[PDB]
């Protein structure tokens, strides 16, 4: 019934600060709290602190003293976390989570990347089969090469293809990321119908479409 919308991913220079936000959709909750949680390397979770927007005090984790400052805007009840004097150790996904007795709702996370490197949009290349192969299914792909920072999101036919899709985790090599995505479809549906990969890179505000054409 309630959804939390976090602000978008951030690329921050070492030494700078960043302020990320978390807003809950319409509700009549009274004594609810919002917790902030750091997930490093897609694995370990750390509780940073929390707030009670309908006036309560703020909880802090002493491990983050001088690193995180939690506030709430009274007007909108939007929650904010400012991260200070950033280093590479602060690169992580930061989640906001709302708790109200027997219900809980987590935001989608905000990826913060701390780096001196600049934004580079991906080069998106369609992968069509070579000479041939022939089965009942055909596998197509899209190579999403040489971007920074994370994330990118990939869809196929704007979401109309999903069950046959595998989008692989990005890998970092020499300060740029590369990922690939594959989609498998019946041989009777391609090339007779269009197949297109859609690649979004929020850091460059790009949404690139590449149609897969037979070689």
């Amino acid at each position: 019934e309630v959804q939390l919308q976090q602000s978008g991913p951030e690329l921050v220079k070492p030494g700078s600060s960043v302020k990320i936000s978390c807003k809950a959709s319409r509700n009549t909750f009274t004594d609810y709290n919002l917790d902030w949680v750091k997930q490093s390397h897609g694995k370990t979770l750390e509780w940073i602190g929390n707030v009670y927007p309908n006036n309560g005090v703020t909880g802090y984790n002493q491990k983050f003293r001088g690193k995180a400052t939690l506030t709430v805007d009274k007007s909108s009840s939007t929650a904010y976390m400012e991260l200070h004097s950033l280093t590479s150790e602060d690169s992580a996904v930061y989640y906001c989570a709302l708790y109200y007795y027997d219900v809980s709702y987590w935001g989608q996370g905000t990826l913060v990347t701390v780096s001196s490197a600049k934004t580079t949009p991906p080069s998106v290349y369609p992968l069509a089969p070579g000479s041939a192969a022939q089965t009942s299914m055909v596998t197509l792909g899209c190579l999403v090469k040489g971007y920074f920072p994370e994330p990118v999101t990939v869809t196929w036919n704007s979401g109309s293809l999903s069950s046959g899709v595998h989008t692989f985790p990005a890998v970092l090599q020499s300060d740029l990321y590369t990922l690939s995505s594959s989609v498998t479809v019946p041989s009777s549906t391609w090339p007779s119908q269009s197949v297109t990969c859609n690649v979004a890179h929020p850091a460059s505000s790009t949404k690139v479409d590449k149609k897969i054409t037979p070689r």
Binding site: L45, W47, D102
Partner: protein, 211 residues
């Protein structure tokens, strides 16, 4: 701070069988919370106050324990339960989480579907040449990929990536990308990706001739 220690870090469970994982606390706590995180999703509270199910959680999940020892149990493991589970306590300031238990499910062995792709014409103009090999929907997760250019093994210049266990069909997939310079790409003719997997005594070979 109260430190939470989970066991096991990773486990493979038979479908339909009982699964148990535990969380040990460095000091007693009144209650323990559990969270599920599926691939590419936020954590979600799953069991709260030791034994209470969150909204939407099915009956096969339960939680138990007291003092310093807590458990999360699945009465009958299903494919959709493959995920990482974290315990979380609210007694101490600060709150803390356990390191997680990564749960995978067993299924019948499945051979990878292997597909090789030449560099796109678009990439070649940039002076790079990536040859991509997908190895899709295999089980078990242990697999090895070898590249060959004109019959000779190439080890350097390869980027591999692996998916987590699929929630629906319980398989794994892999991508392997060999990136050469365009000039080196055009010096050789034959490009091959070979998959070694327990489902076949001989590796699965996909190849193409630069033509």
């Amino acid at each position: 701070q109260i430190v939470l220690t989970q066991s096991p870090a990773i486990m493979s469970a038979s479908p339909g069988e009982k699964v148990t994982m535990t969380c040990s606390a460095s000091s007693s706590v009144s209650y323990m919370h559990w969270y599920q995180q599926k691939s590419g999703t936020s954590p979600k509270r799953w069991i709260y106050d030791t034994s209470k199910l969150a909204s939407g959680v099915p009956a096969r999940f339960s939680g138990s324990g007291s003092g310093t020892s807590y458990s999360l149990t699945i009465s009958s493991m299903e494919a959709e339960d493959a995920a990482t589970y974290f315990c979380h306590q609210w007694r101490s300031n600060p709150y803390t989480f356990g390191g997680g238990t990564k749960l995978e499910i067993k299924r019948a062995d499945a051979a990878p579907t292997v597909s090789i792709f030449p560099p796109s014409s678009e990439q070649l103009t940039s002076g790079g040449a990536s040859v991509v090999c997908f190895l899709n929907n295999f089980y078990p997760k242990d697999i090895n990929v070898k590249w060959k250019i004109d019959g000779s093994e190439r080890q350097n210049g390869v980027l591999n990536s692996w998916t987590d266990q699929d929630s629906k069909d319980s398989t794994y997939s892999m991508s392997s990308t060999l990136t050469l310079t365009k000039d080196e790409y055009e010096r050789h003719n034959s490009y091959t990706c070979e998959a070694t997997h327990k489902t076949s005594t001989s590796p699965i070979v996909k190849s193409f001739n630069r033509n």
